[PDB]
């Protein structure tokens, strides 16, 4: 189910044939909740439009402001120390209670003591264009963990940042 | 009673219900058995036979109502797993007794595939039951219907009308509830008239096959 034909009946059929997504399954007809909307589709896949034949729910359509991320080619691990991240030492004798673990694409690269300053400083340095724009930072309070993602294939969307939103008044409303 | 539980033995009560079930099935089959040997309480049963009753002091049952030579017995059993040598020895003493035309073997926990062929050779017609099938009377249930067996002449007169040869009829199997409750052989034909608001005034005829 990988390569399809491009339709040219009107320009809208060509537009929506280029914005599809598929979950391929083994025997079509016995799947789990694959055919249903999940609440993690919000803002990134349409929960109203889908086929009704055998591919009901298995083929999705991108939302309007939806973006697929791409791989970041610059190294990012050495600029994490500037926000309050420390090394992972080699003694296997020292305990690390209270510290949160940081994980870059699943690889454990360090710890951080204060996690509600590390994340808020990484996010502030991303909003001033010295960290890459497609970098995902997730703080996890229950698992005591900070996950960072820079790989390809993640679904993104734009949002307004409220605390920087007062910087329009002083600007000029040119488009 | 609204919240009463009987603080007595259950096994005497089980043998009580099973023995009155055996008596009921003989009386509704047609043989003459004593009234109020059915209709007696649980309490006077416990007075006459106890709370943990012995099985060989059973009710050796009676003979036919209109006929004389057709007589029958019952045989109760012990709790544990059974071997057919017991059944052959008790059958030797049964045929030594006076005369019968059969008996009802009420078993307890198991019958053996070696047993049914080793009771098949005996000189009368006996039945095998189960002690836990004989608690509720199935012909006292509300959904039960009459199964009046018709005579051999009425079987001939029904086969007269439709020009049929008894294996083109609808059947009822012999390992059925009412078929063993009345002890019917293969080839008899029974009728049943249905009451019920979609099948009222509807009768059926089945051949035991």
């Amino acid at each position: 189910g990988v390569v399809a034909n491009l339709g040219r009946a009107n320009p809208l059929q060509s537009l929506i044939d280029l914005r599809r997504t598929r979950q391929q399954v083994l025997y079509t007809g016995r799947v789990g909740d694959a055919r249903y909307p999940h609440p993690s589709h919000w803002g990134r896949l349409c929960f109203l439009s889908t086929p009704d034949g055998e591919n009901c729910g298995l083929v999705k359509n991108l939302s309007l402001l939806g973006l697929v991320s791409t791989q970041i080619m610059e190294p990012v691990v050495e600029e994490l120390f500037d926000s309050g991240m420390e090394e992972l030492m080699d003694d296997t004798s020292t305990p690390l209670s209270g510290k949160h673990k940081v994980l870059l694409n699943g690889d454990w690269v360090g710890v951080c003591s204060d996690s509600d300053y590390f994340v808020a400083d990484l996010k502030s340095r991303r909003r001033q264009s010295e960290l890459p724009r497609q970098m995902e930072i997730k703080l996890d309070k229950d698992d005591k963990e900070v996950r960072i993602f820079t790989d390809a294939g993640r679904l993104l969307r734009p949002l307004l940042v409220v605390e920087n939103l007062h910087k329009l008044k002083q600007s000029k409303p040119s488009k | 009673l609204s919240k009463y539980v009987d603080p007595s033995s259950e096994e005497s009560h089980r043998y009580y219900l099973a023995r009155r079930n055996a008596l009921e099935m003989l009386r509704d089959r047609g043989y003459e058995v004593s009234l109020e040997d059915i209709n007696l309480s649980l309490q006077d049963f416990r007075t006459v036979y106890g709370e943990r009753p012995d099985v060989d002091r059973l009710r050796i049952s009676a003979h036919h109502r209109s006929d004389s030579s057709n007589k029958v017995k019952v045989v109760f059993f012990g709790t544990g797993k059974v071997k057919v040598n017991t059944i052959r020895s008790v059958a030797a003493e049964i045929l030594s007794q006076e005369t019968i035309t059969g008996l009802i073997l009420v078993l307890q926990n198991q019958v053996t595939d070696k047993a049914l062929k080793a009771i098949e050779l005996f000189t009368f017609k006996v039945e095998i039951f189960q002690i836990t099938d004989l608690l509720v009377n199935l012909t006292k249930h509300v959904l039960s219907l009459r199964h009046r067996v018709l005579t051999d002449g009425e079987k001939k007169a029904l086969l007269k009308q439709f020009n049929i040869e008894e294996k083109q009829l609808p059947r009822i199997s012999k390992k059925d509830a009412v078929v063993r409750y009345y002890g019917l052989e293969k080839g008899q034909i029974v009728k049943v008239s249905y009451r019920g608001e979609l099948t009222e005034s509807y009768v059926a005829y089945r051949c035991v096959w």
Partner: protein, 848 residues
Amino acid sequence: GFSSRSVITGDAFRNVNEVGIPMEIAHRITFEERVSVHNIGYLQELVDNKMCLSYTQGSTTYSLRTVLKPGQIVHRRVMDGDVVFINRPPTTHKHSLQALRVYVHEDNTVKINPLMCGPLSADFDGDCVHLFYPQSLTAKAEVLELFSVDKQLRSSHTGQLILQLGLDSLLSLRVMMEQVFLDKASAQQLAMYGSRSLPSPAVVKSSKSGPAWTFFQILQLAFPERLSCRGDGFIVGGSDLLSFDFGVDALASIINGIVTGIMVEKGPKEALAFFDSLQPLLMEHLDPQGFSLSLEDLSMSREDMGVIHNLIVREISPMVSRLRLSYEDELQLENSIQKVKEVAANFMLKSYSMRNLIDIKSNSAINKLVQQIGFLGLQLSDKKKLYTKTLVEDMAQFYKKKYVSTSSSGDFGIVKGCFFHGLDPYEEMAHSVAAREVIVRSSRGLAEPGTLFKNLMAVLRDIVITNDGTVRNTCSNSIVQFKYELSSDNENQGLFEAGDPVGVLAATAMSNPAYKAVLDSSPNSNSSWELMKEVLLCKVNFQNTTNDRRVILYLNECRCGKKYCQENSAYTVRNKLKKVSLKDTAVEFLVEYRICLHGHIHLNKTLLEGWNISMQDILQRCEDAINSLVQKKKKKAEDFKKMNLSVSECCSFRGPGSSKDSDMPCLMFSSYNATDPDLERTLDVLCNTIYPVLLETVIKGDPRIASANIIWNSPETTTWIRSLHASRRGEWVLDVTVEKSDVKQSGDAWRVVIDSCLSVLHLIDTKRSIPYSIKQVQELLGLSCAFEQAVQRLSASVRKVSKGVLKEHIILVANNMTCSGDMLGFNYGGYKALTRSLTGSQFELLWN
């Protein structure tokens, strides 16, 4: 001979048995005729006018695209008055083969009368039909004689008519009923369409206006001459409509009574002539008035919407956070939301247009309007849906996340808005899950009717009413039934005759409500198809499933005639039955050193008291079971040689964590045969053999009953599994379920419920309690009782989906199931069983 596919459109002004055929189709299809006497000149006219396409004299097919002698074959083109037969492609259309008379037009479609939509189950939204053209003359006779519309007028699935007044005709009759009188000009304009003459006016002169007819005199303009019949709400005498009582709740039934009066005494085609005169009259009546609907029809007021929202936030939302946490048996939700929906429908039928455009008594069509005007209702639940419970938990957490403005202000599965005012994005996602589940259930789930129809036709194909009248199989020549109907004999003819294929009619009358139920996929139409599959798909081999172990227990009536004493007997037997084990009371397992190692099973003090258990009870109920298990199956169980038990209300050993400090109840145990030189193997035996078998010991109740819950029943089904007891309706029942480890062969669950109910059996209604599954009733009560119960269950399930199916097909199905001797199913396990156990050639013509 030939076939043709085309798009259908409608036409109300031609006759019911007429079909309009496009000219491009008609001029390329031929009919063959054998030229002989009485048609030399009539066919010569046709060949002179170049209307015969082809010819064959002898065998050599010479074309004409020649004079006529008697004895060759002319192939002429389709013209007005011929007979074709129509069929929508029979995906579900099992009985839709109709014979129609041809007229020709210039357009591209096939035109049919709008009364023929329901006999074909078609509509005009893109449907195509196939027309077939009969060439042989005996085929023309068979088509004209078996499948004409006047021949097929009374249905063979139900007892009703295949022709019913529908959408615009019924609306025209309703608006003709709400105003009663008509002036002279419109009455004479309508009288132009009647087949009879217009009567004198009912009102000759008022001082206000001129003369005026009533609408009964207009409706009588379609009758035949000298008609005099009678039904429920009408009296017709002397071809005059004398009486017709008020209603809109009765009107369609009164029209059906008038048509069945005409077709019981009037002619060879008079009911069709009645329809052919009535329908264009009603169209021409409605046309100078119009009928529409505005936004005012769809806008409930602010007051009534406030009452709807107040009834929701008062009643529905605090209950739905209680009884949904319980299991499936609490459908009180549906009754309460149906009460609020009744309130909404009573509000919305104040608008005059909306009450004329629906069927008020219908409920599937009245829920759809409540969803538009008022609330949508329940959209998410985790009972018998095709999605899992993790989706429902994710949606509840997402409901907490998105309504950060005062979360838990209602429930997450209830939508409060309407379609007319618009949904939230959250309500749209919740509604979209429910819509997706209905769509998937309607598309993927059309394989069980597809299997059922195949296995139904495979067994019911060759069952015919014979020439002597007995319903018989023909491949084995065995009697399935002695009579098909109850009043059919050789003096009185009936709806069915000799040679009728009653097995195929039963199979199609069974397959129609299944396909209708799955194509709807409502909760009611899902439950009905479940109840139908539980009868039609029984299995002759024992599968010991969940329903096979279920038993319904009834109770007696009126301890000493005191109030509130039947529920006491119910819990008396429940407290005797219900299983609770030692691990349901254990909290910790503490091994002690003081021979040397001594185990301490610790307990909970409170749940002993809340269930009335003492500790000597637990010692007895452990000791008897452990001595039985060291007696039964004697190998690898010699760990209980001289193992010891002991009991105490208080031990207070209190290992390192979660102390109760006093009267933590304890079952100490030990061992004495394990004279070991090491403690490490003693810890293995006391923590890996004894402690497993001492946890699953049951202390109160019977060890074989898995569950025994109490249901109030009283489902206004009036004893759903009882037939003749009383006019009582409110009995409480126990639904006992046995553990899987005890039922080995079929019929065991009744045997172990009655034997475990034995010390309390003086309270249970012995003559009424039954199992739940139909094969278990067959094992308990016999084959005739199973036959009657299968009829009684199949009738209820089929009457919930499609109303009025005749009893003859159901009784034939239940007779064919139980004809082998034991009740079989319509699957492979039943089919191979009987297969292993086991018109044409009806008459002959000749000369005289």
